């Protein structure tokens, strides 16, 4: 039984955009405001304040580590999902002619990094079709049919932001591992949608690099994210953007080496109070139940919505079977067009989003979502037709 | 006449750490809290919320542009000073053998980036002594005696964080411009201390690249900063860390190019409410008077402190003439040591900081600082002796 009162934003609106940004819980707002008060009272720049901040950073790094069942050393703190991807990509020792493989469902921001890399190191990239594997086929097999001699890295979203498909990461990892080419194939995972909705254990699940953010499904504030790097891959990633938070210091205050673990990829001054906000949101989710129970709760709500949409004659879900996670994508048979339909809905305080490719509308159902909100969505969607 | 009441943190303490982080003005805390409320009420992810954020970003970009008297197109928004430096350094098309010159008073974080670059592109770097030019000599001349055939970039702090000297930037720029080698010599300026205290007009002052932050002298919240790049140098800087905020989009939502001006160096989701905070702080400073009046106010206070320290027999200021800005560094003749002396002072709610090189203590005087706080500092410093 979810405590909806902890998320005051739920009232007087019908929110289905958790995948864009989660509704901020009261405890998170409180922790943010309290941090500003602490800095004002004790600093903001001083021995006591600087200590309190270092302690806060360590507490967030630890909560994130526990979240994925890994050691604090494998966790880097960033501001969003993308930065984590920039860290891995710019850190690899790319050689002219190396190749990168991406699914055809990756975020335009990520593709932009790859383009920048290709132009800088003369590497090449190409996509492999996974979108079409929502209701049939096998993305792992598709990848196998694309792996080549110079394939060095594969980039994929564990949960696709556009179609709602949960890719078979374990199988894809194996495929990459057994492959034999000029490089051991490594996989960078974009977890923008998976983290905070899917139960994730990186000690029971082999992963090389996993990027995520705290402002979507974890419901933290905009501006705080993180990155996971398996201990065996750390060496392969050279720090790129660095600062006073990336190194260790000498007797005269000079740089003497890299800071321990993932700290070497952290740059400098950040919005610390936001860190306290994410910490509070993380702890609030553990008090609501285990990751597994929250995931099933999410799936019960997504299936309820999915089922409701199947009944609507002019609505067509992309998934022919029950959603594997909280994302439900669909099209609407109407002359208006999806963009105008999302605006009409927002006019009635119903919040969903449009998806560019494929051209559809997407609803996100979280464990705090209830049947009344879903029925209200269904009621309004019912007014559109050909 | 400064309105000290706008900075509630001033009361019940004696703050001299503006150069580390400024005291947050009430109006900034209000704007931060209001932004969280707007996102909760209208989103946080939605058409209305996304529009409000884009408008907020444009307003801050413009206020910063106006601050330095330049075009909005030359301003990039970052999270701190260091990131601006990473953008310029990683963006240049380095060639094996190129050389970088840095003064012997640059931040250890900046030096760390240069070492990372040297190791990646095989470039070399060396320092030129400016610390000793606080009371005599000429840093521009020192630079002239260090310029070489392969010198491509020079890195310097406009206002030195350790000694408090204001380098002759105009002269240094001329020296670099008239030099003839294999490259036109460009200069990256670290303005962590200069921005917000020194009056800066980049349309009257020739500058290639100028990095800064909003949480020190501008008194904004930790986590928001920016970078200036002259329109003629924009083409030389290749975007490195990029994301969905760095590009323009196509018909199917795919990347089609770089976003206009400085936006190409912005990555992805950020702490937007903090942006509103910096905007509010920036506007509060203009209501207090012009940049010139605030600078003179700052200098009157620094000289007052400097003069008071000259009277103390066991205190020795590094500057033999009146400080050129708000930073006042000095040593103390005592067996205790500077670190122990900064801690005792903090125990009395008097806030200063230690400096590693040279080994001294630094006080920062802002236009909101008053004679009573300075006398209280002098009173307490008087108890230390050999
Ligand atoms: C799959 C995916 N990858 C990256 C992002 C970008 O996240 P940051 O801003 O770097 O944290 C996203 C974002 N998704 C939401 C906004 S476009 C959404 O509405 O799905 C991904 O989905
Ligand atoms: C000259 C200089 N350059 C960079 C910084 C780092 O700033 P960010 O954390 O990137 O904003 C600094 C910082 N100075 C303060 C210590 S962190 C200080 O008190 O001097 C510079 O001074
Ligand atoms: K249907
Ligand atoms: K003296």
């Amino acid at each position: 039984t979810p405590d909806r009162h902890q998320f005051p934003g739920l009232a007087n609106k019908t929110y289905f955009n958790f995948g864009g940004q989660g509704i901020l819980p009261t405890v998170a707002l409180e922790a943010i405001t309290a941090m500003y008060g602490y800095l004002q009272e004790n600093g903001p720049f001083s021995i006591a304040a600087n200590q309190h901040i270092q302690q806060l950073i360590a507490q967030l790094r630890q909560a994130l580590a526990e979240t994925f069942n890994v050691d604090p050393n494998t966790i880097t703190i960033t501001d969003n999902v993308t930065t984590g991807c920039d860290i891995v990509l710019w850190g690899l020792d790319w050689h002219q002619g190396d190749e990168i493989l991406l699914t055809d469902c990756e975020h335009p921001g990520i593709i932009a990094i790859v383009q920048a890399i290709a132009a800088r190191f003369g590497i090449t990239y190409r996509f492999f079709p996974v979108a079409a594997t929502l209701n049939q086929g096998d993305a792992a097999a598709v990848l196998a049919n694309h792996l080549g001699p110079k394939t060095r890295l594969v980039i994929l979203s564990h949960l696709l932001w556009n179609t709602g498909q949960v890719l078979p990461l374990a199988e894809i990892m194996a495929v990459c591992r057994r492959h034999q080419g000029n490089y051991p194939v490594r996989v960078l995972v974009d977890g923008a949608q998976s983290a905070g909705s899917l139960p994730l254990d990186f000690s029971r699940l082999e992963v090389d690099y996993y990027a995520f953010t705290g402002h979507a499904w974890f419901a933290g504030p905009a501006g705080v994210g993180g990155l996971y790097i398996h201990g065996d891959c750390l060496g392969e990633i050279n720090p790129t953007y660095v600062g006073w938070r990336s190194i260790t210091y000498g007797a005269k205050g000079e740089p003497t080496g890299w800071a321990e673990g993932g700290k070497r990829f952290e740059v400098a001054t950040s919005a610390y109070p936001q860190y306290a906000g994410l910490l509070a949101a993380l702890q609030l989710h553990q008090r609501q139940g285990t990751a597994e129970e929250r995931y099933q709760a999410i799936c019960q709500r997504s299936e309820f919505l999915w089922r409701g949409l199947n009944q609507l004659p002019h609505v067509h879900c992309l998934a022919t079977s029950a959603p594997q996670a909280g994302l439900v994508s669909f099209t609407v048979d109407s002359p208006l067009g999806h963009r105008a339909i999302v605006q009409k809905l927002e006019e009635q305080r119903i919040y969903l989003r449009t998806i560019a490719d494929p051209d559809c509308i997407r609803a996100c159902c979280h464990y705090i979502t209830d049947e009344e909100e879903i029925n209200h969505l269904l009621a309004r969607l019912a007014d559109f037709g050909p």
Side-chain angles (χ1 to χ4, degrees), chain A:
Chain A
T1 305
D3 188 4
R4 286 172 55 94
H5 300 160
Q6 294 291 157
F7 301 84
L10 285 163
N12 49 295
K13 66 162 65 70
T14 311
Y15 201 78
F16 286 101
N17 281 333
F18 303 96
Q21 187 165 327
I23 291 168
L24 190 79
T26 296
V27 294
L29 192 61
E30 282 170 343
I32 289 169
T33 302
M35 187 56 53
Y36 276 119
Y38 183 95
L39 298 177
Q40 175 183 298
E41 170 64 12
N42 300 283
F45 190 98
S46 61
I47 310 298
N50 290 2
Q51 171 181 58
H52 192 78
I53 284 166
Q54 285 213 68
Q55 296 178 321
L56 168 65
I57 293 167
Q59 289 178 187
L60 175 58
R61 192 181 314 281
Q62 177 66 210
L64 286 168
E66 299 174 347
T67 296
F68 307 104
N69 192 14
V70 293
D71 188 283
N73 273 81
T74 71
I75 302 293
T76 290
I77 287 172
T78 64
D79 300 316
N80 49 50
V81 180
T82 303
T83 297
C85 293
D86 273 292
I87 287 170
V88 179
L89 293 169
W90 285 101
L92 288 163
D93 189 27
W94 295 112
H95 290 127
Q96 202 170 280
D98 291 337
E99 163 182 273
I100 292 177
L101 296 192
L102 311 84
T103 83
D104 62 350
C105 293
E106 299 313 306
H107 199 74
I110 274 51
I111 295 172
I113 298 177
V114 174
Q115 299 182 326
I117 296 299
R120 216 77 93 75
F121 304 95
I123 65 99
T124 73
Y125 72 92
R126 55 199 292 248
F127 309 87
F128 57 110
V130 302
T133 69
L134 172 57
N135 305 307
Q136 66 84 56
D138 185 311
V142 173
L143 180 63
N145 190 207
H146 287 72
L147 254 20
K150 321 215 81 179
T151 301
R152 194 161 179 183
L153 183 77
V154 171
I155 302 179
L156 56 87
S157 294
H158 191 177
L159 171 50
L160 306 188
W161 78 310
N162 62 172
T163 61
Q165 179 187 358
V166 178
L167 297 181
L169 183 53
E171 293 77 359
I172 287 164
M173 287 301 283
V175 171
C176 282
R177 295 281 192 263
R178 77 177 77 96
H179 175 266
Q180 306 181 195
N182 311 330
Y183 297 109
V185 182
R186 294 264 155 48
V187 180
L188 162 62
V189 184
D190 176 335
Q193 304 301 325
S194 50
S197 69
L198 302 187
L200 298 171
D201 180 332
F202 300 159
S203 76
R204 304 249 71 133
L205 179 64
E206 283 181 3
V207 163
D208 305 317
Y209 319 102
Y210 209 101
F212 56 94
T213 185
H215 79 285
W217 301 86
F218 282 127
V224 191
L227 165 64
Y228 161 89
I229 303 185
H230 191 95
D232 292 311
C233 295
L234 183 59
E236 306 169 53
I237 306 131
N238 298 291
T240 299
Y241 275 28
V242 290
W244 60 269
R245 288 173 62 187
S246 319
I247 76 290
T248 49
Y249 298 83
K252 284 180 63 175
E254 71 296 341
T256 59
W258 295 123
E260 177 186 47
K263 298 189 185 186
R264 71 191 57 200
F265 304 115
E266 303 186 340
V267 184
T269 304
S270 289
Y272 309 127
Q274 271 60 40
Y275 284 14
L278 174 59
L279 215 204
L282 285 177
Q283 301 170 317
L284 172 69
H285 288 122
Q286 297 224 69
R287 291 198 292 281
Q288 294 300 92
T290 71
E292 235 299 291
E293 313 180 311
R294 279 180 274 133
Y295 169 66
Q296 296 296 162
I298 287 178
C299 286
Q300 272 154 39
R301 286 146 179 76
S302 62
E303 190 183 299
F304 190 85
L305 171 60
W306 179 73
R307 181 164 252 108
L309 293 168
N310 288 329
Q311 299 324 309
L312 295 182
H314 308 126
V315 176
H316 308 99
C317 296
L318 300 196
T320 50
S321 277
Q324 307 172 262
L327 285 59
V328 186
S329 291
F330 58 93
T331 67
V332 182
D333 192 16
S334 159
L336 292 176
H338 298 143
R339 276 155 276 158
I341 293 183
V342 167
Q343 174 173 167
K344 233 28 162 329
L345 286 176
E346 172 156 346
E347 288 278 14
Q348 296 170 288
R349 296 183 68 73
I350 293 178
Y351 305 80
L352 284 68
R353 70 160 297 168
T354 301
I355 293 296
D357 185 35
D359 172 15
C360 59
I361 295 179
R362 188 194 71 190
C364 302
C365 298
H366 211 154
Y367 73 83
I368 48 183
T369 301
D370 68 14
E371 271 166 49
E372 187 186 330
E373 298 174 326
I374 293 177
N375 284 325
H376 183 49
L377 206 207
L378 292 173
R380 187 65 250 198
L381 278 169
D383 292 298
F384 303 109

